[PDB]
User: Fold cAMP and cAMP-inhibited cGMP 3',5'-cyclic phosphodiesterase 10A from Homo sapiens.
Amino acid sequence: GLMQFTLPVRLCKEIELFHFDIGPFENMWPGIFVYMVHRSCGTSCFELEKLCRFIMSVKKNYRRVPYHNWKHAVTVAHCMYAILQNNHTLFTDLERKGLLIACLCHDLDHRGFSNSYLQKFDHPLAALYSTSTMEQHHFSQTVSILQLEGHNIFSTLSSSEYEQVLEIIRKAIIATDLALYFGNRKQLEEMYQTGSLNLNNQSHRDRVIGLMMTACDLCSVTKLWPVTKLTANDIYAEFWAEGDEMKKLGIQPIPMMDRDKKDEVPQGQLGFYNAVAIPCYTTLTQILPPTEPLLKACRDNLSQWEKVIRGEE
Ligand SMILES: COc1ccc2nc(N)c3c(C)nc(-c4ccccc4Cl)n3c2n1
Ligand SMILES: [Mg+2]
Ligand SMILES: [Zn+2]
Assistant:
């Protein structure tokens, strides 16, 4: 009960900031996640023995791919932690529990390939789940790990609390399917502008939680320029591997995925910031004003990509 996780002083302070980087020491990441659960939720939210076993099983079920890896999982959970701490009173005990676990699990057993590649490959998961293919797989994998003996971190919830938290995690993980994000933000935009947005409306909370999941999922665009720039190499290493696999199926990939067209990357990140990231953090900053640092950081990195193009780096 009385056993706190503490971090070194620099981590203890920087972990509270949106732009925190979890660092290159893999063995500290489980401790960093537990620390975040303890401050965001309480030291009673989860049985430590079970949580530790759940974390190590989640870690084992992430693959050694350049980007969609265990480090991405913990990075996305830390952004959720920063959003939850800067918006203390807006979220329920169930939501704070559910959302950190959702973020940690949101890309479970990812192969570094998109839903499009699975469909064109004709991968069995594409027959099993016709839309949000990988995301339905990620939720399936989360449930599987929760059902391992000694892994059910939720076992002390009432029957209906358990159903609500698994329903929060499912929606949260499905919302990380970027094809669903565009319509979700458009709706949140209309609701905020016509002033019909209402956080006591469950269906409205769902939408807001989805945008938070998009916001955390993209949070590599909200770090200090060097972090953001070096992560973009990991992201493109997956894209180019997928591009190669498209060519193997006799399909010319989109230029963003073609490793012959690396020149077109900076312009590609521009389109992504303008079409996805900026609109995402703008709408988020309108609903949850304290998340403004993510928008500011994202605009800062947009400006860095403009500089790469103008040949200034
Ligand atoms: C999906 O198409 C793209 C294209 C350019 C990206 N550039 C990024 N900097 C980026 C980031 C931080 N996260 C994603 C992303 C989001 C959801 C699923 C998979 C990925 Cl890779 N992307 C990008 N995604
Ligand atoms: Mg994903
Ligand atoms: Zn992700």
The domain at 28-310 is CATH 1.10.1300.10 (Catalytic domain of cyclic nucleotide phosphodiesterase 4b2b). The two ends are 52 Å apart (CA to CA). The chain has one domain: 28-310.
